[PDB]
Amino acid sequence: IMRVASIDIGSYSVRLTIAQIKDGKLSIILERGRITSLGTKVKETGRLQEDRIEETIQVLKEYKKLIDEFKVERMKAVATEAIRRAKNAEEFLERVKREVGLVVEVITPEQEGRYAYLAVAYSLKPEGEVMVVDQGGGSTEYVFGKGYKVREVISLPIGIVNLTETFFKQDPPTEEEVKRFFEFLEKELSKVKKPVDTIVGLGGTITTLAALEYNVYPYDPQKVHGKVLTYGQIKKWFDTFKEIPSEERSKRFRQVEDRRAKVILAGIGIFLKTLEIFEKDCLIVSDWGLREGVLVSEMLKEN
Ligand SMILES: [Cl-]
């Protein structure tokens, strides 16, 4: 009985995941999430804020204690490329190494994509030529592969927060805004088109869609992981949300968190346009992604 852990340092939250390797199988035994907003003012000041840094470090010390407590044999900590936008990123990483004892790697979208594909290969085993569509954190990675072998990763920086602020100046958006919205996705997605047999979608938007479609509430990974969503099902939710204000979306559908109520429409559009462009009628939904993939990679180095 061995254990592995991963720590994901994002612009919004710091997340810990510990899994156990029992009977030659990976299972999550502990999780923790903490909002520290490390990306605050990085845009206007170009620097990580001292208060955000201090809190993040304190949460990391906490997670390290949990990791040592559970006596984890292998651990890996990663941070989003976004931190690269701060001139004091390296000082922050260095502080984390000395004070917490964690060597954080700022991974590229390509690395992120690989870890996410890894989690899918292990937890779903998609058939034939696979394409993983991971939306979240300000971008959407399109990863191609066969079995555990990743072929290529193509990352597009089309964050839903960015797209919503860019195209939907109104709440809900006007038909023209929506129209301009899709025109952009078509232009960008058409350039990534390739032949694939199985599409797997990852991220908050897609797991929320599955929860909506299959009436899952509260959220339960077991009832969402592996669920199938057709273009029609996804289109139905897109049409339901585009007709009402974000506030109503979260009020009428408990699966939609208020914080996501507004930007989710843009997220749904990404998957919609993706299926259309790649000429596929459906996709499989995965609850596992980056954070779990790091676990799979660490587990593979262990056996
Ligand atoms: Cl995003």
TrEMBL record:
<dbReference type="InterPro" id="IPR050273">
    <property type="entry name" value="GppA/Ppx_hydrolase"/>
</dbReference>
<feature type="binding site">
    <location>
        <position position="136"/>
    </location>
    <ligand>
        <name>Ca(2+)</name>
    </ligand>
</feature>
<dbReference type="InterPro" id="IPR043129">
    <property type="entry name" value="ATPase_NBD"/>
</dbReference>
<keyword id="KW-0479">Metal-binding</keyword>
<protein>
    <submittedName>
        <fullName>Exopolyphosphatase</fullName>
    </submittedName>
</protein>
<dbReference type="GO" id="GO:0016462">
    <property type="term" value="F:pyrophosphatase activity"/>
</dbReference>
<feature type="modified residue" description="Cysteine sulfenic acid (-SOH)">
    <location>
        <position position="282"/>
    </location>
</feature>
<dbReference type="InterPro" id="IPR003695">
    <property type="entry name" value="Ppx_GppA_N"/>
</dbReference>
<keyword id="KW-0175">Coiled coil</keyword>
<feature type="binding site">
    <location>
        <position position="141"/>
    </location>
    <ligand>
        <name>Ca(2+)</name>
    </ligand>
</feature>
<feature type="binding site">
    <location>
        <position position="139"/>
    </location>
    <ligand>
        <name>Ca(2+)</name>
    </ligand>
</feature>
<keyword id="KW-0106">Calcium</keyword>
<dbReference type="Pfam" id="PF02541">
    <property type="entry name" value="Ppx-GppA"/>
</dbReference>
<dbReference type="GO" id="GO:0046872">
    <property type="term" value="F:metal ion binding"/>
</dbReference>
<feature type="domain" description="Ppx/GppA phosphatase N-terminal">
    <location>
        <begin position="17"/>
        <end position="302"/>
    </location>
</feature>
<feature type="coiled-coil region">
    <location>
        <begin position="53"/>
        <end position="99"/>
    </location>
</feature>
